[PDB]
Design an enzyme around this catalytic site. Structure first.
Site, PDB file in Angstrom:
ATOM      1  CG  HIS A 131      -1.151   4.761  -2.038  1.00 55.64           C
ATOM      2  ND1 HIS A 131      -1.581   3.503  -2.401  1.00 55.64           N
ATOM      3  CD2 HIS A 131      -2.250   5.428  -1.613  1.00 55.64           C
ATOM      4  CE1 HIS A 131      -2.882   3.408  -2.191  1.00 55.64           C
ATOM      5  NE2 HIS A 131      -3.312   4.562  -1.712  1.00 55.64           N
ATOM      6  N   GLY A 179       0.550  -8.381 -14.236  1.00 52.72           N
ATOM      7  CA  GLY A 179       1.172  -7.422 -13.343  1.00 52.72           C
ATOM      8  C   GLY A 179       2.686  -7.371 -13.412  1.00 52.72           C
ATOM      9  CG  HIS A 187     -10.214  -3.929  -2.452  1.00 53.85           C
ATOM     10  ND1 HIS A 187     -10.873  -3.782  -3.654  1.00 53.85           N
ATOM     11  CD2 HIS A 187      -9.608  -2.741  -2.208  1.00 53.85           C
ATOM     12  CE1 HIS A 187     -10.679  -2.559  -4.113  1.00 53.85           C
ATOM     13  NE2 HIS A 187      -9.915  -1.907  -3.254  1.00 53.85           N
ATOM     14  CG  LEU A 198      -3.675  -5.974 -12.992  1.00 54.08           C
ATOM     15  CD1 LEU A 198      -2.337  -5.906 -13.710  1.00 54.08           C
ATOM     16  CD2 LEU A 198      -4.299  -7.333 -13.211  1.00 54.08           C
ATOM     17  CE1 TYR A 199       0.651  -3.934  -5.460  1.00 56.52           C
ATOM     18  CE2 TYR A 199       1.450  -3.419  -7.658  1.00 56.52           C
ATOM     19  CZ  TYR A 199       1.679  -3.882  -6.380  1.00 56.52           C
ATOM     20  OH  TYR A 199       2.943  -4.288  -6.017  1.00 56.52           O
ATOM     21  CD  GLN A 259      -2.917   1.104   2.346  1.00 57.41           C
ATOM     22  OE1 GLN A 259      -2.648   0.428   3.341  1.00 57.41           O
ATOM     23  NE2 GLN A 259      -3.971   1.915   2.292  1.00 57.41           N
ATOM     24  CB  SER A 271       5.911  -5.229 -11.400  1.00 58.96           C
ATOM     25  OG  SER A 271       6.815  -5.148 -10.312  1.00 58.96           O
TER      26      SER A 271
HETATM   27  C1  LIG Z   1      -0.258  -7.176  -9.640  1.00 61.89           C
HETATM   28  C2  LIG Z   1       1.140  -7.689  -9.422  1.00 61.89           C
HETATM   29  C3  LIG Z   1       1.619  -8.745 -10.193  1.00 61.89           C
HETATM   30  C4  LIG Z   1       2.906  -9.247 -10.028  1.00 61.89           C
HETATM   31  C5  LIG Z   1       3.738  -8.690  -9.067  1.00 61.89           C
HETATM   32  N1  LIG Z   1       4.994  -9.140  -8.861  1.00 61.89           N
HETATM   33  C6  LIG Z   1       5.508 -10.233  -9.470  1.00 61.89           C
HETATM   34  C7  LIG Z   1       4.970 -11.595  -9.243  1.00 61.89           C
HETATM   35  F1  LIG Z   1       3.917 -11.792  -8.430  1.00 61.89           F
HETATM   36  C8  LIG Z   1       5.561 -12.668  -9.898  1.00 61.89           C
HETATM   37  C9  LIG Z   1       6.649 -12.477 -10.748  1.00 61.89           C
HETATM   38  C10 LIG Z   1       7.197 -11.219 -10.986  1.00 61.89           C
HETATM   39  C11 LIG Z   1       6.667 -10.091 -10.377  1.00 61.89           C
HETATM   40 CL1  LIG Z   1       7.366  -8.469 -10.679  1.00 61.89          CL
HETATM   41  C12 LIG Z   1       3.230  -7.566  -8.245  1.00 61.89           C
HETATM   42  C13 LIG Z   1       4.106  -6.937  -7.187  1.00 61.89           C
HETATM   43  C14 LIG Z   1       5.003  -5.881  -7.791  1.00 61.89           C
HETATM   44  O1  LIG Z   1       5.991  -6.201  -8.427  1.00 61.89           O
HETATM   45  O2  LIG Z   1       4.728  -4.588  -7.633  1.00 61.89           O
HETATM   46  C15 LIG Z   1       1.939  -7.100  -8.450  1.00 61.89           C
END
Ligand SMILES: Cc1ccc(Nc2c(F)cccc2Cl)c(CC(=O)O)c1
Ligand SMILES: *[C@@H]1O[C@H](CO)[C@@H](O[C@@H]2O[C@H](CO)[C@@H](O)[C@H](O)[C@H]2NC(C)=O)[C@H](O)[C@H]1NC(C)=O
Ligand SMILES: *[C@@H]1O[C@H](CO)[C@@H](O[C@@H]2O[C@H](CO)[C@@H](O)[C@H](O)[C@H]2NC(C)=O)[C@H](O)[C@H]1NC(C)=O
Ligand SMILES: Cc1ccc(Nc2c(F)cccc2Cl)c(CC(=O)O)c1
Ligand SMILES: *[C@@H]1O[C@H](CO)[C@@H](O)[C@H](O)[C@H]1NC(C)=O
Ligand SMILES: *[C@@H]1O[C@H](CO)[C@@H](O)[C@H](O)[C@H]1NC(C)=O
Ligand SMILES: *[C@@H]1O[C@H](CO)[C@@H](O)[C@H](O)[C@H]1NC(C)=O
Ligand SMILES: *[C@@H]1O[C@H](CO)[C@@H](O)[C@H](O)[C@H]1NC(C)=O
EC number: 1.14.99.1
Lengths: 552, 552
Positions: free
Chosen positions: B176, B495, B357, B353-354, B172, B499
């Site tokens: 942010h 995600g 909740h 995706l983030y 969080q 990321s």
């Molecule tokens: C919605 C989401 C999806 C994947 C991740 N991290 C992530 C993962 F969960 C598996 C492999 C590589 C990465 Cl960078 C993350 C966490 C992040 O890297 O900010 C969030």
């Protein structure tokens, strides 16, 4: 006080203080090591012998015309060479950008604040004993004296490359979209937050300004018809702010993207031409897409005109002043298998290099008239009088002044040429030789080597004493020109990296943008890929007059 | 009306209207051709058989732990694999960015306006018959019904991966800084104009706000000491604006970079930790550089904490939720011989995706107390009561909720979870299967395939009727989890590209920045490269309590 004031680190090594009177050089990935990064690694020593001098590469490109005739018609070979042109130049540019006028060290403020011009070399620290660091006297020579002795024009010296006024005003028009100094903040600040070729000088910097300029029908920009001819709208019609003297009639207060383009009819000429080009492209796109709305017609036309601008700048504009026999090529695909950053930050030095004051003539000869600076300035009545057609024909014929070689700055703009000196010092620029070394050039060992003659060299030595104290900007105007060229070595070898990086760094050159769908299909894509300074004038100026960047 | 409403173009081909009821697909560099870019080229057909399924790559990385033990200790091999991780993921991201909420076609407005979140898939055009394009009914199922039936928490379902509250609040707090929706403009707009990890949530978005937060001595940030403990300054002492209910005492109104971090003590805990870390690093840098001023001490510490942040995110945070036995590595050098754009634009979808909740617990258990949402919200008194040490120890022990698997959204935040659904529709998101295909995933053929069970699947089928109409966001929370994992396939495969691209796209990861001098020398450089979530807590929290992103 600062131990880095002597600029001890060589070969683009970075200097850091490790105490009050001690320093350390960061030689990371420079190819050198040792206290000052002067001891070459093994692979480095090899390249030093292989890699040719810039005055040799320039020679090859500007000679052997018969050989280039063969190469230019071999697409594989032409693409190969243009590829090397793009890569070798852009390697000299830090991307993402680093320093600015307020930061001689890397910092997030320097990176993130888009209001700064960036800097190819860090400013000289404020606590340094001399303006250049440690060498020279407490104060640089009087800028008025530098100006009058070696910069001011005696007799008009024409460009041997034959650059005309179409070239001169294009340069002024084109570069004023990313050279927009925020004089409220200081010379190291800019109002062009796009930091590139976004055509804000046509469409406006802000969304508010853009909407005032738009017709909101068929993607077009507002315009008016005078004597059956299309001209920009007025300030009264659009409420966009422009810069005009109070005595200027409001029907002559044309409103365009750039607020200063009312300054000279030459700029207003190009603003009108590009305005017509936008609406012409709107008509073409509407023919192809009757299902498209005003907004998409506008946006797609803007992306197309960006493509045309880059196309024209590379294959006409740069093609001319470079003097190359090699036929330059705008082809974004050349970088698709290369390492390249599709981003750009406008360098302060690039702006300083582009202060081509000697380019201006003594009079502006339109038709059978010869206007002085006083008569020409802020006088759009001249443009309505003769028309775009007569403007193009006249400016195609009138030669411009040589930039290098010394003593060719028209006295009408002497306050401007002096400001370049003053403001360069205000921004704490490093010396000429520091900038030459930064871009792989050997430092000048004497003022005579710089000028290629005796008189001006002697004048400069009385003022600067040491060649290592010589300033960048006045050196550009007095530098020994290349054989029958408009520029000296420093101007081109420093400017080309900034230029090509800015042109190819545009997002439309990136693989996700460079495709027909971005430009509304193959028809719009073809407009970019067949653009030229001649076709631009031919499609938009009545009678389709011949034009070029050189006299005939 | 729009002929592209059915999203006919496959394999990332781009759709363009060629009439009122006709379209054309741009198959450029997609590896496919044909009307809809579905017919593979020869090289493409090969890769299709070679390239493994994501649920197979995930399997390899999360199994054969004995094998990874050997690989992790072979620097050459570890670097080789991490290299592939970074390159294969970032290839899914358009860079420079393309679409936003207002532009389903490329345009300079979409590119240049940083106030927009960018979009991985263009919005469904407004003149489309159905919310998803052409499939489904005139209106999507009632979001309240979707919420109550398959999203709301009945019994608390703990994360099988053991994610704790240190993890939840780190997520969080961390996100942010680039998820700062401008609710004044709409859900598709952001106030985070840096579009990445700039630590503005610590230092402030604007220069005005930063100077109010700074001490202007030794590069440090302002602070106060309460009970011998270092805490952020107050709103009254610094005049920086924060979001607090009117009944909150001004001695409890702590002022930090992000205006909303007073919302929960969990965020204020991390804000305090990072505040202490900045000042700690200032002391270290001052020790090495007594000749440095406040400004350089501040800027250099900031670049260091940016480095630490990325280091911790990759090697602790991502290391945890990925479930990998492979030891991830933050090493900018891995991309120096690779094609990579050091820039980033925050995607709207990444924000969606983030919305984790279900991660939140039913109560926030600190020491022997168990606080409700009502008691916990806007209550920094809880933080002063127990102290940072007790916060860290308690949050390390408390497990968090499973995100995928369905029915784990705490009812205390149901209004927020419903908004996520509604705002997704407001921004005209495409369907779940459209976004799966965009990131090289096969579409789900049934609701049962999506959930991996029967009950929730039946519930959804009555609401959505067709699987090709199923929305992205609620699909993430009801998706069949990976074996003993917190997420389903869609969440991770979508995600991870956003990321890693944001992390490595930071300018400090660029070759010109990634060197010791940038961070004040080897000492500061070492801080980045030895950073960990534990060392962050150990250096800044009294007693050096054990911490981790998982329960013990
Ligand atoms: C919605 C989401 C999806 C994947 C991740 N991290 C992530 C993962 F969960 C598996 C492999 C590589 C990465 Cl960078 C993350 C966490 C992040 O890297 O900010 C969030
Ligand atoms: C980015 O786009 C937004 C949305 O179009 C712009 O915000 C609009 O600004 C105009 C002023 O010209 C206002 O009248 C509108 O109400 C604004 N709309 C919204 C949704 O806020 C914003 O100006 C653009 N930013 C830049 C730098 O051009
Ligand atoms: C970019 O840097 C300039 C120069 O520091 C900032 O302009 C200053 O802003 C402060 C307000 O915080 C004023 O008090 C100063 O007078 C300004 N100085 C100058 C020279 O204009 C500017 O705010 C920065 N831009 C951003 C987006 O942070
Ligand atoms: C200060 C300056 C220096 C060089 C150029 N152009 C140029 C040149 F003069 C030779 C080779 C390549 C290029 Cl891009 C220019 C013109 C331009 O490229 O915009 C200005
Ligand atoms: C490095 O440069 C300094 C100052 O420029 C000089 O005094 C010193 O001799 C140099 N060290 C070398 C060349 O090894
Ligand atoms: C402007 O140009 C016109 C020619 O069209 C000329 O008659 C007039 O004197 C000029 N104005 C000034 C102030 O020189
Ligand atoms: C392309 O897609 C359209 C609509 O999705 C479909 O009607 C058409 O048959 C497709 N053409 C192919 C697959 O060649
Ligand atoms: C805030 O937390 C304290 C414990 O430190 C508690 O006594 C108080 O009731 C809480 N405030 C509210 C409004 O619940």
């Amino acid at each position: 006080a600062n131990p880095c004031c002597s600029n001890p680190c060589q070969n683009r090594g970075e200097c850091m203080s490790t105490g009050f009177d001690q320093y350390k050089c960061d030689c990371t990935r420079t190819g050198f090591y040792g206290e000052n990064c002067t001891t070459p690694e093994f692979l480095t020593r090899i390249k030093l012998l292989l890699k040719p001098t810039p005055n040799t590469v320039w020679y090859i490109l500007t000679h052997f015309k018969g050989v280039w005739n063969i190469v230019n018609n071999i697409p594989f070979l032409r693409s190969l060479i243009m590829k090397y042109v793009l890569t070798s130049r852009s390697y000299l540019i830090d991307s993402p950008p680093t320093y600015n006028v307020h930061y001689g060290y890397k910092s997030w403020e320097a990176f993130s604040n888009l209001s700064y011009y960036t800097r190819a070399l860090p400013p000289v620290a404020d606590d340094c004993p001399t303006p250049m660091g440690v060498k020279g006297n407490k104060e640089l020579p009087d800028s008025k004296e530098v100006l009058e002795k070696v910069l001011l024009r005696r007799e008009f010296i024409p460009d041997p490359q034959g650059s005309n006024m179409m070239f001169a005003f294009f340069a002024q028009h084109f570069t004023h979209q990313f050279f927009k100094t925020d004089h409220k903040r200081g010379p190291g600040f800019t109002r062009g937050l796009g930091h590139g070729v976004d055509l804000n000088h046509i469409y406006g910097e802000t969304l508010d300004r853009q909407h005032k300029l738009r017709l909101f029908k068929d993607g077009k920009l507002k315009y008016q018809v005078i004597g059956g001819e299309v001209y920009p709208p007025t300030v009264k019609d659009t409420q966009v702010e422009m810069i005009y003297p109070p005595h200027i009639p409001e029907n002559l207060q044309f409103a365009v993207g750039q607020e200063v383009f009312g300054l000279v009819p030459g700029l207003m000429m190009y603003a009108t031409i590009w305005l017509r080009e936008h609406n012409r492209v709107c008509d073409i796109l509407k023919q192809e897409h009757p299902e498209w709305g005003d907004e998409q017609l506008f946006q797609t036309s803007r992306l197309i005109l960006i493509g045309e601008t880059i196309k024209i700048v590379i294959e006409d504009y740069v093609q001319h002043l470079s003097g190359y026999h090699f036929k330059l090529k705008f082809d974004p695909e050349l970088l698709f298998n290369q390492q390249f950053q599709y981003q750009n930050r406008i360098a302060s030095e690039f702006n300083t290099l582009y202060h081509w004051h000697p380019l201006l003539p003594d009079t502006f000869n339109i038709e059978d008239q010869e206007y002085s600076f006083k008569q020409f300035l802020y006088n759009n009545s001249i443009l309505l009088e003769h028309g775009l057609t007569q403007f193009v024909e006249s400016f195609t014929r009138q030669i411009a002044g040589r930039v290098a070689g010394g003593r060719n700055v028209p006295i009408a703009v002497q306050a401007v040429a002096k400001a370049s000196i003053d403001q360069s010092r205000e921004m704490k620029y490093q010396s000429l030789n520091e900038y030459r070394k930064r871009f792989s050039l050997k430092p000048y060992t004497s003022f005579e080597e710089l000028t290629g003659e005796k008189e001006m060299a002697a004048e400069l030595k009385a003022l600067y004493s040491d060649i290592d104290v010589m300033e960048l900007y006045p050196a550009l105007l007095v530098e020994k020109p290349r054989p029958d060229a408009i520029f000296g070595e420093t101007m081109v070898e420093l400017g080309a990296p900034f230029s090509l990086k800015g042109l190819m760094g545009n997002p439309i050159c990136s693989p996700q943008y460079w495709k027909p769908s971005t430009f509304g299909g193959e028809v719009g894509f073809k407009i970019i890929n067949t653009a030229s300074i001649q076709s631009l004038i031919c499609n938009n100026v009545k009678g389709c007059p011949f034009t070029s960047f050189n006299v005939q």
